[PDB]
């Protein structure tokens, strides 16, 4: 037994004598094909990269905090492998976002002149690029929650580093409370918190005190101007580029809400042929040619347009300058309404503080705040984790999926509200939903990035030809009422909203609302689509979103093979889908 | 509550998906060896309420299927009724009928028609990636369903399979490799086994393992998908199973014979100025887009550009890569004012339709694996085709009336190669055979149901060789072996020059060894020539490094089929996670690795 701990972990769990031998290979013909590790110089993390690997070598769990552009994502997993880890277990690096993991992966693979699904490989959905060679394993943080079940020690890993920590989603808060649970039993293994430097002492708190290695290189300070206040919010973008395209050279990032919005502005910024300025929008559906012109070098100014994505994940090369209009898409349990919604909201002051600082990395930044400092200081200090704005039947829906046990007894990093824990157990039995274990249906609702009881009409309506009208009503729902009534009105606006009032119930003004804003972003130029919605007392913002929402939901229920009708349906099937 | 039976139960389990009814029927079988009368109850009762929910697994893919319909002018659409009714009534059919027939797009919709794919999988290999990809995304589209839904497919990296999916393309390595897991593929309820005219390993695997199963799988069906070459063959392996014929009217294809004419004294000029002499020849014939014939894609590089320089009038020239932009991909079907040219190939022999061509030129060759007993090596040469094969490539002017196939050979030619291609399995070292086997699980080489069975006399020196390589005993040695399409010595080479990081000079050899010459200390004589047409191959102008390779003894149609059996090693080894040197290694740990 003594020969055997320098076997790969499954192997060794597996015998504990010449299938050892054997066995001993594997590894040997592994080391064989690890890489010359190399490090670009400039980078912070590469910079300290001796404290980090003492740090990862004589602790189980380190916390690694830093500014974005650091180094952290691209050079940690390099680290690993300089301290000898990634032979007998993978190093398993997990993202919130499939398409950040395989550009990652693609990028280090790069950086070490190695293939991606060589020593650098990934797993996401549709594709797990990883071979008998792999060392680093990137991955979504949902891809390593969905592997427990079949590997509940997590054996083919000696190391986890977790990404992006400090955006606190439900999976990445299911994953540091299952790898708490996880540790005593995995003395080999190796655990890394990587994070934006926003209160990493609570991660510390939960790894019994663990160590925390801020990596943060040098930082300038970013001069900040407010700039209180459709095209009201469309033109506010509109005055910030012009001021800013009067400073020196530099790229310019503009933080956006949503995709749609992206195209608008970016639709509209062209149309304004801004002299030697280049508009680029980054959505999530870009070619493998765009992928890096964004890295590439440039002739003149750029201004590129994102979603938060962009705030502490992605690094945008050359920005000088940001707008801030200071809300993003954030779910968010609704008391009122009794569903899990997508609100735009006030971003927290951690987070207008991270947009602030993809300014600060040269001297003399400028960022633009469209609203006041007197909001500023009225925001939280922090965003509230997702753990603590969801209702607990999605949280025990999504538990019960993963096979996580009860939800009483995980050890979250923040705890969920234990009152609401039996309300939410009754909604998924009362749904259909469970037995805890899945029931078929449940299955499918856990797949469904909607509120359940939203999700289950969605399936039921498959049922009744009527699924498009299910995606219509239930994106309507899961945002703040498109139709605005200004009290400095109430006359015009709930006269124009009456175009659209249906018989029997209330959710088929949304769907004659949704028919009825079709037909008229096909009519009209999308600046007077726009205009429209000041006119019909629209929030433009909302109804790009609902549009965004219903397109994001349609892929995924065609993806699970739901169908859904090419032609509206008519009105009794889509109620006895309701009722 | 109320009293539960064995017989009632086992009843249930016939509303269950297959899977689900093998794992239940396995249950209720120990529950009859339990004493205990109280203690089946109970587990009677507790495995009843899993039933009820397996069973809704069964109404959610239900739910799921899609509209059937079917595109008019296929003869396969047409034929529609006597196939279905073929494969109802029968366990196993083999559908035959030339390229262009409506077999791969529209079986998978027939046996869904027929209600398959809802207790298990319909199964559909393809002999390529890119193919199953494509046809998956070809149906999905005609059903109006996204990839991935009813519609998906598994490859190596990308397995677009829902809860709900249907029908699963894949390539028939795939299915082969899920054998280990699931022994009587009881995820299928249907297997379609496409392009199994080429007669590769995987097929021939797949064929034997099929009709072992058969008596252990009553409720499998089997289609045999075939281009019209000897699908008797196929017929009596499956015990005299019913030959569907799905072709359309046959067209009659004028061939013409045009024997390269060496009269530029060259080889490559002479093939090349044959295919002028063709294009101008067909030229003159009314309407139509002409299709070339290719052995592999750096030659259909060279007659690209050469056909460029002809500045031909409204004629578009259109090569077929494998790794095309697929929206590259969709301008084969897309429409043109001109000619159009499109060179490829033997992908669009019989597994790629390419629309609207009237026209054919043939010069005869391809790619094939074939072992030396000279050089004990399995070489890839290029050599003539069968009569089989050319008659394909002919076929692919047949869909209208006055099609002309030129043949870039004589009739005389012609006739003296043999009637049809070996199967791969007539032609592979033994070794390989076996090591490929052991690493499926298929068992004995002297038990497996060979569609035609190698030479015996050759297998117990393939073990031998395994044993000497350290690959069986299977070893983690011997998986990686099986894993290198290569010679399994060459493979040998390959892994332990890994430990150096010479994999791209232990690949040099490997491709110099798999053709004939260009032109232990021999071998580096490979390494040192290569090293050097690389170097001059950047220099020099486009289309003039041609002229350099008469400097020395070097053929410059030789050097090109080197690079290009090496670019497609390369491709393989990377795909394997194989590191690969950028830069020339040092010499002889070079020797240190053979
Ligand atoms: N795909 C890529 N192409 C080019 N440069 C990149 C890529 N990904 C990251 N970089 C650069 O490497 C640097 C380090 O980025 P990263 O490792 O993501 O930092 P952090 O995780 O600390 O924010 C950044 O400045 C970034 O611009
Ligand atoms: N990806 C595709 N795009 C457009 N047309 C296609 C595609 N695949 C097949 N087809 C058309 O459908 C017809 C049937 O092709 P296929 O089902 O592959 O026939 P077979 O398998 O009998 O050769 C062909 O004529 C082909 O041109
Ligand atoms: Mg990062
Ligand atoms: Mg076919």
């Known amino acids: ?43 912070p993390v590469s910079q300290k990269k001796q404290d980090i690997l003492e740090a990862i070598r004589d602790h189980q769990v380190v916390i690694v905090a830093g500014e974005t552009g650091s180094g952290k994502t691209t050079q940690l997993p390099k680290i690993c492998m300089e301290l000898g880890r990634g032979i007998k277990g993978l190093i398993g690096h997990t993202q919130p ?29 549709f594709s797990n690029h990883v071979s008998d060679n792999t060392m680093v394993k990137l991955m979504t943080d949902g891809i390593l929650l969905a592997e427990i079940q079949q590997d509940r020690l997590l054996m083919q890993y000696d190391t986890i580093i977790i990404d992006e920590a400090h955006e606190r989603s439900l999976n990445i808060d299911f994953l540091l409370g299952y790898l708490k649970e996880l540790l005593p039993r995995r003395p080999d293994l190796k655990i890394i918190i990587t994070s934006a430097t926003i209160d990493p002492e609570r991660f510390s708190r939960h790894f019994n005190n663990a160590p925390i290695i801020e990596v943060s290189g040098r930082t300038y300070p970013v001069e900040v101007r407010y700039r209180p206040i459709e095209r009201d919010q469309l033109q506010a973008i509109f005055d910030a580029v012009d001021e800013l395209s009067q400073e020196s050279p ?31 929008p980054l959505y999530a559906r870009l070619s493998n040619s765009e992928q890096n012109r964004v890295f590439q070098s440039h002739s003149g100014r750029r ?29 968010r349990y609704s008391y009122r309404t009794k569903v899990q919604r997508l609100p735009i909201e006030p971003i927290s002051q951690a987070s207008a503080n991270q947009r602030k600082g993809r300014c600060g990395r040269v001297s003399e930044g400028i960022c633009i705040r469209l609203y006041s400092e007197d909001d500023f200081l009225s925001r939280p200090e922090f965003t509230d984790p997702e753990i603590l704005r969801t209702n607990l ?22 705890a969920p509200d234990k009152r609401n824990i039996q309300d939410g157990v009754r909604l998924l039995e009362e749904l259909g939903a469970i037995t805890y274990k899945l029931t078929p249906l449940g299955r499918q609702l856990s797949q469904l990035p909607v509120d359940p009881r939203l999700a289950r009409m969605v399936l039921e309506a498959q049922k009744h030809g009527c699924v498009r009208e299910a995606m219509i009503i239930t994106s309507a729902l ?9 009290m400095d ?30 037909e008229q972003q096909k009519a009209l130029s999308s600046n007077a689509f726009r205009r429209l919605c000041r006119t019909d007392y629209l929030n433009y913002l909302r109804v790009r979103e609902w549009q965004d929402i219903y397109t994001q939901l349609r892929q995924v229920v065609k993806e ?12 009794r099937e889509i109620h006895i889908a309701l009722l």
């Open 393 to 414: 039947a999605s949280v025990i829906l999504q538990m019960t999926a993963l096979g996580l046990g009860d939800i009483a007894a995980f050890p979250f990093v923040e």
């Open 250 to 280: 530099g790229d310019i990032l503009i933080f956006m809400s949503g995709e749609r919005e992206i195209r608008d502005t970016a639709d509209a910024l062209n149309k304004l042929n801004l002299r030697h300025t280049e508009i680029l």
């Open 560 to 571: 699970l093979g739901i169908p859904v009708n090419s032609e509206p349906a008519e009105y």
């Open 97 to 125: 976002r499939r398409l950040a993991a395989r550009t990652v992966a693609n990028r280090i693979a790069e950086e070490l002149k190695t293939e991606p699904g060589g020593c650098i490989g990934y797993k996401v959905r």
């Open 489 to 518: 009105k109430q006359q015009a606006s709930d006269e124009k909203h009456r175009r659209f009032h249906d018989k029997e119930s209330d959710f088929l003004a949304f769907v004659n609302l949704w028919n009825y804003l079709g």
């Open 1 to 43: 037994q003594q020969r055997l701990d320098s076997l790969m972990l499954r192997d060794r769990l597996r015998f504990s004598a010449k299938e050892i031998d054997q066995a001993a290979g594997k590894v040997l013909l592994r080391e064989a094909a690890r890489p010359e590790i190399t490090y670009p110089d400039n980078l």
């Open 478 to 486: 899961s945002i703040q009422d498109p139709r605005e009534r200004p």
């Open 303 to 331: 201004i590129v347009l994102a979603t938060n994505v962009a705030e502490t994940s992605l690094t945008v090369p050359g920005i000088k300058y940001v707008i801030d209009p200071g809300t993003a898409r954030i779910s």
